[PDB]
Design an enzyme around this catalytic site. Sequence first.
Site, mmCIF file in Angstrom:
data_model
loop_
_atom_site.group_PDB
_atom_site.id
_atom_site.type_symbol
_atom_site.label_atom_id
_atom_site.label_comp_id
_atom_site.label_asym_id
_atom_site.label_seq_id
_atom_site.Cartn_x
_atom_site.Cartn_y
_atom_site.Cartn_z
ATOM 1 N N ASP A 6 0.869 -1.167 0.000
ATOM 2 C CA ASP A 6 0.000 0.000 0.000
ATOM 3 C C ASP A 6 0.918 1.232 0.000
ATOM 4 O O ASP A 6 1.448 1.629 1.040
ATOM 5 C CB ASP A 6 -0.946 -0.043 1.208
ATOM 6 C CG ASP A 6 -1.904 1.143 1.266
ATOM 7 O OD1 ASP A 6 -2.893 1.060 2.016
ATOM 8 O OD2 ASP A 6 -1.683 2.162 0.595
ATOM 9 N N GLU B 94 1.544 2.547 12.930
ATOM 10 C CA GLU B 94 0.472 2.449 11.942
ATOM 11 C C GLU B 94 -0.621 1.594 12.585
ATOM 12 O O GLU B 94 -0.562 0.371 12.571
ATOM 13 C CB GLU B 94 0.973 1.854 10.625
ATOM 14 C CG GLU B 94 0.078 2.168 9.403
ATOM 15 C CD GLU B 94 -1.209 1.376 9.406
ATOM 16 O OE1 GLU B 94 -2.149 1.763 10.145
ATOM 17 O OE2 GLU B 94 -1.288 0.362 8.670
#
Lengths: 299, 299
Positions: B11, B104
């Site tokens: 990603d 994250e």
Amino acid sequence: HYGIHEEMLKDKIRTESYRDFIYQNPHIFKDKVVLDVGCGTGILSMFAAKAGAKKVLGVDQSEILYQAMDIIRLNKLEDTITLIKGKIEEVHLPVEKVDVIISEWMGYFLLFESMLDSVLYAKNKYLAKGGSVYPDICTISLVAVSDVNKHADRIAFWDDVYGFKMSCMKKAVIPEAVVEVLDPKTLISEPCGIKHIDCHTTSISDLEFSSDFTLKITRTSMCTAIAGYFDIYFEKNCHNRVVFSTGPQSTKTHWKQTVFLLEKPFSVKAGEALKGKVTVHKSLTVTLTLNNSTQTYGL
Amino acid sequence: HYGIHEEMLKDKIRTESYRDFIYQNPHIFKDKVVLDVGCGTGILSMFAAKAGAKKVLGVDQSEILYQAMDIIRLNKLEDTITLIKGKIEEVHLPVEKVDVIISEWMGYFLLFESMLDSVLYAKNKYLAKGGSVYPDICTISLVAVSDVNKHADRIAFWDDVYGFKMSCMKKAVIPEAVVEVLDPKTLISEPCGIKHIDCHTTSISDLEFSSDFTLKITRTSMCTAIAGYFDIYFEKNCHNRVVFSTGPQSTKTHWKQTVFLLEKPFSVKAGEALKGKVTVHKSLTVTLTLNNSTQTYGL
Ligand SMILES: O=C(NCCC1=CCCCC1)Nc1ccc2nnsc2c1
Ligand SMILES: O=C(NCCC1=CCCCC1)Nc1ccc2nnsc2c1
Ligand SMILES: [Cl-]
Ligand SMILES: [Cl-]
């Protein structure tokens, strides 16, 4: 949860195959007692009722069974279809035997997380002498794949990840079998059957098996993976036989295909007879030997 | 398992945003003690080490931590990066305080299955007085959707399923929020922020919240769903600020968008100020009131 049932219903190949089998062979169902193992929403039970079943028993262990009850009522079939919540090995049925068993039990690569064990239990405990189980014949096949770009995406990718070495992750991703629809142009051999199952005679122990296989190579290329799929047949006593395949040359289904990546891709030539061995063991694992390397894969 | 980590690494919006923040603001990391909460493969820890961190502590409860150990060694960073396996609330760190926390942690619709709780715990227990947490600012937004064809696919579909009524299944699928990339042409309002979080001051109890919202309708159409997404900001003490959005007008990410289907679509007109209310409660549920109907959704 319910979205999954929706997905299986919207799988036309899957659902229309069962619909066609039942509707085009109503002689199999006319005035019969039918057991639907893992009935979900009850759709197969309603097909069987429409084809003239005297009685249908739909069994499922999931909460979907409560929706099925409401569905059966909306379709005014409650006097034909009885629904029972629980595992087939635990529930009490209102009959001793049934004439026909139908079930959509199939998993990825046929056997991963499949309900075949429950179907065979139902067959052994409840199927009347001379009764029938559908689908009655299943096969599993392997096919060689060349996809150097996809292999590079999965494997060589780990050598440089935003400037850092991650080579050790190769060993972690190789054993994970992949469920994915394959581009049929990437197939580089004829398929080879590795397993044939007739539900009438198959036992649970037959589901752990080994097969020597030979892949007839059709394109000179780098072999980067081996793909697996299965075919489903409705045969016994049918005037209208029904088949579907879940292979890459056929319309995609929710089962897609199963892909076993090779750690070391190797070149093959058209006309070559490529020999290997495959074994499936109980979660299932798949052990592949090919080009003098062995790897065990899981889903 | 490992495939998921691969997906998050691939990603670009996600991973390059963090990379850009760290590499373009090395003053935040130079000679600092850094804690990486839920470090996965260790990639954020290695970014921080490259930007000049004196010490980085990477913590993760998953088996991926063993891969991270090998990764850190392959990159010759073991004298800077120490990895610790376990929950942040249970492990023993080799320092009392840290200067910077990076993580994250974000889930679908920001908060579904997120690690924010662990980040805030780490912030409260371990962040030095005057330290910083990144990303530091997050927002959640809602946007109205018109997609009569997709709504018909999910809802009206149940009225006739291979000749049978299944209307009752509508009630089962409506409450299931959908994670999907939306065609930006189907958006029919300006977005409306419903939540702003600064990680420096946010408490765990702030994550259960209510918001009155107003959607500025931009197209006369049938509103069939409400979509949610989130934006992530790296702001505090940055010379190079970094933002990314997970909304449908931006490059797709693995978070996609979150979709709440309306049971009863209703017509709206361009220029209309459409008012509603949303509440998020601890698995999370989302309660929406709009056009005098209320529905609670889950993921
Ligand atoms: O490996 C995948 N698909 C998995 C895609 C994924 C992407 C990001 C992380 C999670 C998994 N396909 C695939 C098909 C044919 C192949 N032939 N030789 S190698 C090879 C590979
Ligand atoms: O509902 C989905 N996607 C879910 C697809 C699915 C297909 C088969 C069963 C499992 C779930 N998207 C979607 C997007 C925008 C919409 N706007 N008004 S309604 C609506 C719906
Ligand atoms: Cl090639
Ligand atoms: Cl419209």
